[PDB]
């Protein structure tokens, strides 16, 4: 059914810790953080100082994944140094359950996150940066309305820079 987003809290950290150690996640995210790693890195107030907002994806009253949005400009640590536009938001996300992968749930999560961010009238464009090897994530982002721009170097290595502008989001709301 319907994928929604709520803010992540401190109460979600043990669950997030478990998720980040599942093999389908460890593969693409990180790696293998301890409980204390997750607690000190993903505490919502700690993420705040990075301009990162954490969310839990919800489906039929159950938590099914983690997402984050961030302000690209001024990200620090070598991140997004050529950005000039404070309206740009980036996203990252994962699905908690291996049994639920490749069933279009990720596309729904991404669509829900993109709609959320464009409801901040200050947001001009959403970016994402899946690794070149992560073809499944790239295809998920494409189905969700993102377009591949090219390869950029990040502190996590080269990435496929993908974007969806507000104008593209407006134009793809109706077929009128």
Ligand X SMILES: N[C@@H]1[C@@H](O)[C@@H](O[C@@H]2[C@@H](O)[C@H](O[C@H]3O[C@H](CO)[C@@H](O)[C@H](O)[C@H]3N)[C@@H](N)C[C@H]2N)O[C@H](CO)[C@H]1O
Give the C-alpha separation, 99 to 24, whole Å. 10
Query: Chain centroid to CA 25: how far?
Result: 13
CB atoms within 10 A of CB 16: 22
143 is known to lie in a ligand binding site = yes
Cβ atoms of 88 and 124 within 8 Å: the answer is yes
> Looking at 33, 54, 65, 90, which residue binds ligand X (CB under 6 A)?
90
Ranges within 24-43 binding ligand ACO (CB under 6 A): 24-25, 28-29
22 to 41: interface string for ligand X, x by CB under 6 A: ------xxx----------x
Give the C-alpha separation, 85 to 82, whole Å. 9
Binding site partner of 168, from ligand X, ligand ACO, Ca ion, none, Cβ cut-off 5-8 A by kind: none
Cβ atoms of 148 and 162 within 8 Å: the answer is yes
Cβ atoms of 32 and 52 within 8 Å: the answer is no
Cβ atoms of 46 and 80 within 8 Å: the answer is no
- Least distance to ligand X from the beta carbon of 1, Å? 25
- Residue ranges of the annotated binding site for acetyl-CoA are 93, 95, 102, 104, 106-107, 134, 139, 143
- Residue ranges of the annotated binding site for CoA are 93, 95, 102, 104, 106-107, 134, 136, 139, 143
Residue numbers of the site for ligand ACO (CB under 6 A)?
Answer: 24-25, 28-29, 92-95, 101-107, 128-130, 134-137, 139-140, 143
Residue numbers of the site for ligand X (CB under 6 A)?
Answer: 28-30, 41, 50, 52, 70, 75-77, 79, 90, 92, 129
């Amino acid at each position: 059914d319907s994928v929604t987003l709520r803010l992540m809290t401190e109460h979600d950290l043990a669950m997030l810790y478990e998720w980040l150690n599942r093999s389908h996640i460890v593969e693409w995210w990180g790696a293998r953080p301890t409980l204390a790693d997750v607690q000190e890195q993903y505490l919502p107030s700690v993420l705040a100082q990075e301009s990162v907002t954490p969310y839990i994806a919800m489906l039929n009253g159950e938590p099914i994944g983690y997402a984050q949005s961030y302000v690209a400009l001024g990200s620090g640590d070598g991140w997004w140094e050529e950005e000039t536009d404070p309206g740009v938001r980036g996203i990252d996300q994962l699905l908690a359950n291996a049994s639920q992968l490749g069933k279009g749930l990720g596309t729904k999560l991404v669509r829900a996150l993109v709609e959320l961010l464009f409801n901040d009238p200050e947001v001009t464009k959403i970016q994402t940066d899946p690794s070149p090897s992560n073809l499944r994530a790239i295809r998920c982002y494409e189905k969700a309305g993102f377009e591949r721009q090219g390869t950029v170097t990040t502190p996590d290595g080269p990435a496929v820079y993908m974007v969806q502008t507000r104008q593209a989001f407006e134009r793809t709301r109706s077929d009128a």
